[PDB]
Amino acid sequence: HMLSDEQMQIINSLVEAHHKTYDDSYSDFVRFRPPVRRLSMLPHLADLVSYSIQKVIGFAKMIPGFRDLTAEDQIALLKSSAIEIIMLRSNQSFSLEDMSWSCGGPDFKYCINDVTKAGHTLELLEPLVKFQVGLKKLKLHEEEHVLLMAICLLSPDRPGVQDHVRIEALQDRLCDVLQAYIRIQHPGGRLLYAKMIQKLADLRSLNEEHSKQYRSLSFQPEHSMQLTPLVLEVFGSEVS
Amino acid sequence: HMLSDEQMQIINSLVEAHHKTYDDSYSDFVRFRPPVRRLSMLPHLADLVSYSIQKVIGFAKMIPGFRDLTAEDQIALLKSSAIEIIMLRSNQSFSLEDMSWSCGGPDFKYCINDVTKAGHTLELLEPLVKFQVGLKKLKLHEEEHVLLMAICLLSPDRPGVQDHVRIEALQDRLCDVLQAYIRIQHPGGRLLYAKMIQKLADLRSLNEEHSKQYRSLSFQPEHSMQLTPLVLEVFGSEVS
């Protein structure tokens, strides 16, 4: 009926980790190749994604226990989950009014139409936007949002993970925290935990569709040359 | 005492090739990651170099005979010579008044100090700037400038070339053209051909120093991640 002290330490650590790696001013965005509105938005969006991967790495490194995993497992988790975390963390900039991600100025407002000009199709972008509004409607506390990113990251059912038992134990601890937080601190959240778990299922489907469409980009050198080295590494298919 | 018809065809082809691949308006530069003045200029200069490599490829493809070389030889010539051609072609933006490369607006004016903020040292930048002023003082006709870029590109003494005899024959033809052009069309150019050949020697030394310093960048992943895929490919050490 009350959160334990070690549970709230986990929440505090995760909130601080997200605050250190998510800059609400979006002032770094001016450093990206500018947006252009065939794949006119691919340079800007490639830089946005590459920048966001670095932030997700920085967040991962501050999840309790992640840094104690083997380097291979840390990479395996990041390679399969980075795109899902980007999709989850982007909900903070998503607007129900505009049906778009608004990152400060109008140059950094991203429509569905912008993302099609980076090589993606409605097969991905329709479920992605439905995901964003459903997630936005959940009205998650910051505590819950960061717990869900951490649970997503620490999923043991990813290709290439070795220490399955250690990662599942870590994820189990985080799920316990989130269930207890919702029950005690979220008024009217009786169905919230189940909804959040469903969103993790949705992200798997979005992950699959994104990887399919990314393979088309990466197989065409005039497009893949527009990506960044970090995007090529993380979204690529090399195995450790 | 007069240029032959096949010699002036070569000149015409090369001039047209340079005009198609060198845009004097510099309007594409706004598409690069913006300049920032530790290696604050590395993103902008990486994009400038990557863009310039694409132009040098496009110029190479229009040199008579280059496209008839094997793909491996085309790559070998481009990998060893791209940095020299960039240094040669950049003389068009170099200003004796400012001791700098001025590409339209003041955001795209590059000092020696700008290039140090991309990871290079005076060991490279001092000889590079002395090279630019000496080359600028030669006051080359456009015909001569483009011939020298083509002769530079078509050098058979590069690591990894296979069809040495074919490439040297091509370069010999271009040298004959340039010697004849200077003699007939360049008043007071008795010593010009020798000076231009010396500049090719200077570029070898600049190439060596650049490759040495590039190896330092490329061995540090926080810097190499700022490069482009094309720069990593062309300036890298992989062999076909």
Binding site: Q54, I57, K61, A71, Q74, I75, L78, K79, P229, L230, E233, V234, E238, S240 | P221, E222, S224, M225
Partner: peptide, 10 residues
């Protein structure tokens, strides 16, 4: 392999 990832993971 995964040169940048290793570096970013410290």
């Amino acid at each position: 392999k995964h040169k940048i990832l290793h570096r970013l993971l410290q």
